[PDB]
Amino acid sequence: MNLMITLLTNFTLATLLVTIAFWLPQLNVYSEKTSPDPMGSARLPFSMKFFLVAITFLLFDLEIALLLPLPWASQTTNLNTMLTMALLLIFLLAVSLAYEWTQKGLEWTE
Amino acid sequence: MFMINVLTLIIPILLAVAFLTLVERKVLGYMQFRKGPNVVGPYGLLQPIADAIKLFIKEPLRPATSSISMFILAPILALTLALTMWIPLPMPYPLINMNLGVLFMLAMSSLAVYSILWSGWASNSKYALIGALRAVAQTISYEVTLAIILLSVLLMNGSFTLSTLIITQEQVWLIFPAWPLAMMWFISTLAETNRAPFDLTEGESGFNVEYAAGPFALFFMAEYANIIMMNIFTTTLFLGAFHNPYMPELYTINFTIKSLLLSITFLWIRASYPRFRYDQLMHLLWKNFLPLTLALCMWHVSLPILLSSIPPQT
Amino acid sequence: VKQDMPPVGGYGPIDYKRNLPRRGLSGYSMFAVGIGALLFGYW
Amino acid sequence: SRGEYVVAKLDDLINWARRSSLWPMTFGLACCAVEMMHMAAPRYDMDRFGVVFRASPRQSDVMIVAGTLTNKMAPALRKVYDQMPEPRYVVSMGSCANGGGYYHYSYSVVRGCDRIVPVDIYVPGCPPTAEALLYGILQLQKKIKREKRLRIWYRR
Amino acid sequence: SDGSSRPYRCKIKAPGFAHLAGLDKMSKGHMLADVVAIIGTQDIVFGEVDR
Amino acid sequence: TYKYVNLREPSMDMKSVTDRAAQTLLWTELIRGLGMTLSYLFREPATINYPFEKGPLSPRFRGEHALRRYPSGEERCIACKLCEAVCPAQAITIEAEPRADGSRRTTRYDIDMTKCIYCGFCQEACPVDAIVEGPNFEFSTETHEELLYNKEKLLNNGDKWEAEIAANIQADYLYR
Ligand code: SF4
Ligand code: SF4
Ligand code: SF4
C-alpha cells in the first residue's frame, strides 16, 4: 500500500502543478486572443514506412518478451537444452532481421 | 514516516532538474568561451528561482484544442512517469525494494512515449503530428535496443533485483568485462533522451509546439528528470561503488560523484557534435547497432555456462 | 613626415599553412588492451 | 497599511523574477541581426544577464525587431507578435525599425515598426553597437523594475 | 551616367541571386532536412538577394 | 597557382586501413574533438563586465550628433546648409534668418535620429566644425519623439560633451 501511497502522492503533486500552470494565471486580465503550419488544406499523407517500422518494433518487442526469462532460467538443471533454445531463439531474431533487411524494409527509412 | 521519505525523494528531484538547467547553461557557456548567468546573485545561484517564477505567471499560447482532456492529461502523465520512476534506485537502499525493479523502470520507460503521442494528438497541426510520429518511432526502436542491452546486463547479473547488483559489483566494475555493451549503453543513454547529436525535436518543429508554456516547462522538467534517472542508473549499474553495510554515506558520496561526472560528460557530448538526420540514426540502429547487440547477447548468454560462472538467483 | 608605416626591417614571418598534430595508439594494440580487460573482468 | 506593503513586496518579487529572465525572439532580417549575433559573442555575453540566445517565439518575453520591416513582412511580424504570450515587450534595433532610416522614402518600406506593433525601447544606430543594445536591454529591465501591477490592482 | 552628378541606372548584381535560382535543381532527390545545408553551402544573405 | 583540396588518395596498405578501422570503431577523431573542447573549457573567458567595463573604441567613433561652440561663447554654425545638402537620409532640416545683430545664424536645426544612418558626411562637410558626430552612444529612448532632435537638444548635447569632443577633435584633426 506504500507503493500506491507514493503513486497517489506523485499524481496529486502533478495535478497541483498542472492546476498552477492552468488556472493560477487566469487571475490576470491580459487579453483575449482571437488569432484569425505548412499544412494548407491537404490530407495527412500515409507514410507507410513509419507504420512498417512500428509493427516491426511490435514483433521484435514481442519476441524480446519471449527472450526475457533467461536470468531466472539460468539456474535450471538441464543447461544444454536451455543453451540450445536461447541460441536458436537469438538466431531466429537474426534471421528475421536478415529478412527485414533483404525485402526492401530498410530502405528510404534506413 | 513513509510520506516524509516520499517528500524528501520528490522535492530534491525538482531542485536537481532546475539546477540541471542552470549548470547546463553555465557549462555550455564556459565550453564555448563565454560566461553563464552571474548577475542575479552570487555565481548565478538565484537564476532557477527566476526561471520558475517567470514560467509560473506567463500567459498560455491558447491552442485550438481538439481534446481538452487529453491536453490536460499529457503533462500530468509525463511528470508522473518522470517522478514516480525514481523509486527502486539503491542509494544505498531503495525507497521501495522490488524483486523486479529494473523490469519496472524498463516497462514505464517503454510506455513513456504516451505523453509524446498525446501531445501530438492534442495539436491540430499535422506537421506536429508527423514530428510526434517520428519521435515515437525513434523512441520505440531505441527502447528495443535498450531492452536487449539490459537483458544482457541482468543475465550477467542473474537476478532482477537492483539492490543485489551492488553486491555483484564489489570486486570489479561491470564496465571491465562488458565494455562493448558499455559503449552501446552510452550511445543509448545519449540517444534515448531526445538529445543532440540526435535531437530531431528541434531541427526541421517540436512535438509540443502548440502546447502552453506551463506544459512546456513540465515536459522539460520531465525530460531532465529522465536524463538524471538514466544517468544515475548507468552510474549504479556500470560503475557500482563500494558500499559498507555499516558506513553507507561513503557509497552515497561515491555514486553522487560518478553521477555528477557522468552528467558533465552528457553536457560535454551535447556540445561537440552536429545533429544527425532521421534516416541516419535509423540506419545507425537498424543496420549497425542491432546485429552487434544480438551478437553480444549471444556471447554473454553463452559465456557463464562455459566458464562455470552462472551467477546465483538469490 | 609621419604616417603609418611598417618597420624598416619589416614584420616577422606569419604562419598560414595547415598544421594538425595527428595522434594515435595502434588498432592491434588497442584491441589487445580490450581483450586483456575482457579476460581480467571474466576471471 | 499591511495590504499596500505586502502587495509592494510581492510586486517587486515578481518584477525581479520577470526582469531577470528575459527570453528574446530575434528577428533575423538585416544588418542589425548580425550586430545582435555579435552582441551574443563571448565578449559581450547576453547570457550572463539571464537572457537566453535564440528562443522559440511561442515562449519568448521580448522581441527585438532588427532590420527593415517591408510591406511584404508586416503581416508576418504582426502574426508573430500576436502569437507571443503576455506580457510582451518590443525593442527596436536600428534606424530601419525606428523610422525607416535610410529607406524612409522607399515605396515598399514601412516607416517605423511602431506602425505595426507597440514599441517600448528605441535603440538608435545604424547599426547600434553591441554595448548600446546591452544598455537598451538594461534600460528595459529598469523599465520593468518600476512596474506597479499589483499596487494598481489593489488600488482599483 | 546621364552626364549630371546623379546616376541614371545602377543595377546591383548579387552573387547570391543566381545561386538561389538553382535551388530547385540543387535539392532534387534530397531529404527535407538537407535544405538547411544546401542553403548553408551557398553564401546566401537576404540583403543583396532582395535589394 | 591552384591547389587540389580534397584530392588526397588514401593509402590501401594494412596499416592505414587498420588505423582507419580503429578510428571508426574507437571514435579517435571524436576523442580529438573532446580534447579540444576540454582544452577550450579551461581558458579565461573574454567577457567584459558591462556596464562596469567598456569595450575598446577609437577617437574617430561616430555616435550622437552635437553642435559645438567657439571658445568665446558663440555658436559655431553659420547656417550654410551644407550638412542638409550632403545628408544621404535627409535627416537634417535647416531654416535660417538673419538675427538681431546681423549674424547669419540658424533658427531651426532639426536632426531626425531615426532617419540618420550615422555616416559622418555632415561632420566632414561642415566648414566650421559645427556639427560633430560625437562619442555618445548610450542614448536609447523610451519614446519615438525623444529621438527627433531640435536645435536646443543638439546645443545641450554640445555643451554637455564639449569637454571630450574638443579633445577628440584635437587628437584627430591632423588626419583630416
Ligand atoms: S538600421 Fe542600418 S545597420 Fe540596421 S538593418 Fe537598417 S541599414 Fe542595416
Ligand atoms: S551622419 Fe550622415 S545620415 Fe547622419 S545626419 Fe550626418 S550626413 Fe545625415
Ligand atoms: S554644414 Fe556646418 S555651418 Fe553649414 S549649416 Fe551645417 S552645421 Fe551649419
Swiss-Prot record, chain A:
GO terms for cellular component: mitochondrial inner membrane; respiratory chain complex I. It is an enzyme of class 7 (translocase). It holds the Pfam family Oxidored_q4. It is found in: Mitochondrion inner membrane. GO terms for biological process: mitochondrial electron transport, NADH to ubiquinone. Its EC number is 7.1.1.2. The chain crosses the membrane at residues 3-23, 50-70, 79-99. It is a multi-pass membrane protein. GO terms for molecular function: NADH dehydrogenase (ubiquinone) activity. It catalyses: a ubiquinone + NADH + 5 H(+)(in) = a ubiquinol + NAD(+) + 4 H(+)(out). InterPro entries: NADH_UbQ/plastoQ_OxRdtase_su3, NDAH_ubi_oxred_su3_sf. It comes from the Eukaryota. Core subunit of respiratory chain NADH dehydrogenase (Complex I) which is composed of 45 different subunits. Interacts with TMEM186. Interacts with TMEM242. Belongs to the complex I subunit 3 family. Core subunit of the mitochondrial membrane respiratory chain NADH dehydrogenase (Complex I) which catalyzes electron transfer from NADH through the respiratory chain, using ubiquinone as an electron acceptor. Essential for the catalytic activity of complex I. This is NADH-ubiquinone oxidoreductase chain 3. The gene is MT-ND3.
Swiss-Prot record, chain B:
The chain crosses the membrane at residues 2-22, 68-88, 100-120, 147-167, 172-192, 213-233, 249-269, 290-310. InterPro entries: NADH_UbQ_OxRdtase_su1/FPO (IPR001694), NADH_UbQ_OxRdtase_su1_CS (IPR018086). It is an enzyme of class 7 (translocase). One of its GO terms (molecular function) is NADH dehydrogenase (ubiquinone) activity. It comes from the Eukaryota. It is found in: Mitochondrion inner membrane. Belongs to the complex I subunit 1 family. This is NADH-ubiquinone oxidoreductase chain 1. It comes from Ovis aries.
